[PDB]
């Protein structure tokens, strides 16, 4: 769970997982199945590209550092909205209620 949470990428091969957990790639597919089932993670499993594709992480303890991190992205999105809304005023200037 942990290796998945601290990183920001959404997939891992069986090879990375097997070294981490000290299990062969045979048991690793069982390991994945229990985790999804418990409600720790969501995703899908391939055995033909041998990826686990994560799509959900469980919200855990929020540390001081992670608040700063949240915030940075919101500033990115504010600007984007404000920019678009300026253009959308210039456009359609004579047609409004």
């Amino acid at each position: 769970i942990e290796t998945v949470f601290v990183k920001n990428i959404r997939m891992l091969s069986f090879e990375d997982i097997s070294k981490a957990t000290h299990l062969p790639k045979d048991n690793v597919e069982h390991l994945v199945m229990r985790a999804i089932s418990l409600g720790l993670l969501k995703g899908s499993i391939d055995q033909v590209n041998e990826l686990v594709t994560i799509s959900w992480v469980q919200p855990r303890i929020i540390s001081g550092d992670q608040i700063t991190k949240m915030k940075d992205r919101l500033v990115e999105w504010n600007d984007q909205v404000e920019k678009l809304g300026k253009k959308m005023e210039a456009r359609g200037q004579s047609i409004w209620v």
């Binding site: 999105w77 984007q80 909205v81 678009l84």
Partner: protein
């Protein structure tokens, strides 16, 4: 001012939309329905051979107008598809 505002989740709603399954359905229904009044519409302009606006309406039932029902249905589906593209195209680039 209190009376003029009547909503408060108006800001949220203008950037929501429905499922897109029923949008596709309205677009099909609109086009197929306009064929069926387009057939009548050709027949209507065979006539318009009777002097006087009133005589035309009484005699050949010029009031049950195919003209009115096409213009209006074209208008409705048309105005809707301008907004639909507008909302969706804002949503992808703004949010992401």
């Amino acid at each position: 001012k209190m009376l003029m505002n009547l909503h408060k989740e108006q800001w949220q709603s203008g950037l929501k939309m429905y499922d897109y399954e029923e949008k596709e359905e309205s677009n099909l229904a609109a086009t197929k329905s306009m064929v069926k009044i387009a057939e009548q519409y050709s027949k209507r302009i065979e006539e318009e051979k009777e002097l006087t606006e009133e005589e035309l309406k009484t005699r050949y039932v010029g009031r049950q107008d195919p003209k009115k029902h096409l213009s209006e249905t074209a208008d409705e589906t048309l105005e809707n598809n301008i907004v639909s593209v507008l909302t969706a195209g804002v949503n992808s680039v703004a949010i992401k």
